[PDB]
Subunit: 288 residues, 4 copies
């Protein structure tokens, strides 16, 4: 069971990426048991990052670790290919992309052709990122059987959906991307890519270790606390809340998200910290 | 009753915008009776265009006409503001943006703050572009009541939703963005922003003229044909099919869309042309 | 253009149908221009009515008028067939049914077989009632082309959907069932089946007469008022509000709906009447 | 961990319930390790059953066991209350209902008042049946906090939604109603109400026993097979297919479903049996 972190991209107040904070953050996550870093994913504001910002994120993280999966998706296949060619010359775990997005009603063959082009040029293992609620498309096994897929990150609240890949794609590693299903993924799939690893990494690593010891009740209790947090964060914007919580739980500044993913105001951040306080104590009591 | 065209962005085989073809195309549309041009819209591949590409489209079109609505949306508010400051220097119809997109579950206040920032800096009338099927969000009238909105392009199959803006926002011009509801829009709203104006402009202009003469049956008859076209185009990818039809119907080359919006292959194009031929005859018979 | 009323079913406080009020209500609607009555439809609580209640509704109304379309749907085809055989012996306009409901994931052939059985035994014209938001199924033309369909009531906010039937089913009468699209239906389809005819029949008949005279602006203004009413009624329960409004606008008691379609409390009914007052005056000013 | 069966209602060729087959079937299920029976559920054709039919199913089953959850829902609260008063006289596990259905856009208070009325008159523990895909409504925990709820059957593919009830309603027993999530439910909730218990009860009982022994891999392996079955059944109509499989797997005839839930033709049945045969072998090999 692997615990992969879709790392956040720290920005300063002017909306410029702070690579020092990114490296400090990554080192800490890795020291605490995180198995790999998914760069430029949804939590990392991937689609909001320019071609060069995606590249600079990889370069910065490449000075810290080799355990990197590079997400390269954009709405111009020329730019995507430029990022694949760039990453070919580096020693990373894999290259990834979510499907074409924004435009509705694109024929399925477009999705297929998109991935075939990435597969044709990449010299790295291919990780399909399936996120229907975000892109508007569900990549079906029909298209995946044709491609050299190594792993799939499936963001879907229906575990049966993630499990269907495991069955139809022999040998492919499947990871579910929801924080609210970690316990179930750790008992049925190859791991998880969970946004919450950004601020409670020790908690998620503890879940896997408890499950490895056969202590499921304990792992389920941690999951219940996680699901309560997730429920509180919705009203503030889950990604935006994460920045405040990393500082709260981990003790270092990771800056702010970049608008339209607006940062929490001072009041919102103070309000958030009050709501989560009881969950904090209870989590630190079970994980120390 | 205004007939607005979301003009396509001509690209060459390498994916570079061809601004000469953009000008030739826009000029023909105006001569055929199109009243204004929505620049960098969905049909124009807006979200897939870089900041610079969006700017050059506006510069190019400005030479042809000033009846331009400048769509500037992106997932980095700083780039949006940069385009707004740039357009403040020019004499145009207005500035527009669709809502933030991709990221699901963003709080409503985020959408409000995004539009507030455009308004704060813009010296042009604001045109709100609502396309829930694409962005994942519906901009309710409640958010628009505080902004200096002059126009709303509403791409929604429910005409009552478009009429709702009319009712709740006095003095605001509302245009529906669906090709399949043109007839109804010309009988209730302030106009239409229909992608089919790119290849059958004279048909849509003829519908308005027939309606103004009281010949609704004839206009409705033209709508039936338009809706049959829409069904055929879906299979090929509507935007991609438009590039092929512009050449067919108008006589000049507007190039290709840019992948992930894949161009039709020569086989596909020839297949499309045969399939729409009977409809093309019925069209060119009712619209001399 | 026909104006069909999906008549409400009056109940007393004990949940028993009051046929005298039903007849009084029907006479008034017919005197005011309503062209036909759709019995046991959604507004008439069809699926909540027992086999015998559906039969008694038809018998009672049959003492008032011959212009009746009899909706007979239930989750036991034996009961549906018993109602079709019963109605065969009476002189009415047609027999109707919405699709199988409740159970999700039923194969399309089930819908087909359901209607084929009704078509096999009925000696009356068949009216398909398509209401996807209620049944969970959209009956596609594929199945309708095989059946002897005379008319279709399409409840869908997408007029292009209702218009698609007109085009694919030559000779079939198509009526849209939304109060918020009446104006558009009266300008493109064969009529409407609108719940609001229960309390503002003169208003809807006036819309058609105005459109018949070419006075579209006037007909659109009436539509704007209708859409404002619809928006106010949602919070109370549209069907439940109708009972109170029939009494308000028409001057006779039609009783109450039957739980789970709960009646408005005294306070709710008083609150409703206050909200609609301005719309009343403005409607009675334009229709007297 | 409770394994509950939503028992099918056996009908003869004419559509009359066969209570002898209902008893034979229930007895076999108990002997194979099923713990309780959910009577008149979706799989039991609840909504399609008349008030009297729902009552006779309970009377019949009562002779076999008292571990009965009596589903009483209908679109006439008076009939619901009549069934509740009747069941108050009997010694059963509890009384249940799914929410009001068909009618869309009912206010939330209507759903609350419906359940309040059942609670006011019932002398048995209340089991809330949540099936949004069928009824069109999701019963939130907020409505349940005031009622004396003892159990919740949640048919939802999102396990976090089922876990949410656990977290927000202390002391309430929660069971997930999906065949494709059985494994996960047996590792986190209080049990399952799975329709496949009708034909592969020993498989589901074996999953629980394997889990209790710590053999998760074996239980997960059985889930894969179950999920492959679910895919095959969809095409034929899941409920209808179950009647054919009960005879196949268990050796006695449980008749036919009742139209609109059409029985499989002899050709369809023979086609189903061939398609599931390979899976049946893998099943009967891991479950001696
Ligand atoms: Mg370096
Ligand atoms: Mg009589």
């Amino acid at each position: 069971m692997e615990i992969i972190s879709p790392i956040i991209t720290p920005f300063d107040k002017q909306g410029k990426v702070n690579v020092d904070a990114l490296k400090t953050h990554a080192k800490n996550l890795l020291e605490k048991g995180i198995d790999a870093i998914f760069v430029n994913g949804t939590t990392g504001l991937g689609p909001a990052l320019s071609k060069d910002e995606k590249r600079q994120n990889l370069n910065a993280l490449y000075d810290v670790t080799h355990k990197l999966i590079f997400q390269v998706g954009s709405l111009n296949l020329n730019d995507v290919m430029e990022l694949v060619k760039f990453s070919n010359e580096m020693d990373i775990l894999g290259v990834s992309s979510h499907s074409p997005y924004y435009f509705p009603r694109l024929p399925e063959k477009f999705l297929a052709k998109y991935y075939e082009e990435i597969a044709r040029i990449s010299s790295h293992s291919l990780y399909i990122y399936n996120y229907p609620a975000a892109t508007g498309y569900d990549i079906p096994p029909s298209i995946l059987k044709s491609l050299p897929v190594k792993g799939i990150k499936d963001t879907n609240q229906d575990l049966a959906h993630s499990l269907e890949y495991k069955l139809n794609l022999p040998g492919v590693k499947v990871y579910n991307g929801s924080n609210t299903l970690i316990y179930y993924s750790l008992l049925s799939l190859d791991g998880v890519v969970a946004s919450f690893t950004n601020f409670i990494p020790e908690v998620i690593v503890k879940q896997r270790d408890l499950i490895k010891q056969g202590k499921l009740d304990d792992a389920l209790r941690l999951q219940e606390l996680i699901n309560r947090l997730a429920d509180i964060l919705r009203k503030y914007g889950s990604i935006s809340a994460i920045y405040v919580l990393v500082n709260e739980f981990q003790g270092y500044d990771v800056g702010y998200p970049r608008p339209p993913i607006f940062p929490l105001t001072d009041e919102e951040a103070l309000s958030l910290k009050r709501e989560i306080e009881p969950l904090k104590r209870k989590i630190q009591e079970l994980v120390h």
